[PDB]
Design a protein around this ligand. Sequence first.
Ligand code: HEM
Ligand SMILES: [Fe+2]
Length: 153
Amino acid sequence: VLSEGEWQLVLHVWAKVEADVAGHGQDIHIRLFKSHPETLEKHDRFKHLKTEAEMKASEDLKKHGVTELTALGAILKKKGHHEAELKPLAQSHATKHKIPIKYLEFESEAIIHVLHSRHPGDFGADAQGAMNKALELFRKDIAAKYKELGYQG
Ligand code: HEM
Ligand SMILES: [Fe+2]
């Protein structure tokens, strides 16, 4: 369980994300797609963007990142009481997009790296530790939802 203070650290750096959701989403995908090229294949519809500049210039990829980040933020704000919006997410990612939990750990690494690069003064050790906890709680719970629908994560 996260303590109240850890949820507050998570939501404090999240307010900084919400200052530029589109830019954060672009930077998280570029980082994810550079670190773990297998993960850009899964995003088959962006599979052909070759450079960071092309990635930034994609309004489609830009909107996609805002959609994912908006969904994650709504989850984080529930501070763990998030079953209701995990269910539709798990169903689409399990049965449609086919995303293993290790891809989710890859994306969490990219989130933590982008949040650190962009807001170090608002994202130090206690905060990164609280965000790692939040995202692993998200991974744990959705892994469970995966199983409930069949097919492992
Ligand atoms: C914080 C974790 C994530 C959240 C909250 C997020 C959420 C979303 C949402 C809300 C959508 C739009 C509706 C959908 O089709 O169900 C979406 C689509 C998608 N997501 Fe995720 N996602 C996450 C991580 C990932 C990861 C790790 C991958 C693959 C490495 C991924 C791949 C996809 C793909 C391929 C689609 C469809 C994109 C298309 O429309 O071109 N998702 N995701
Ligand atoms: Fe994505």
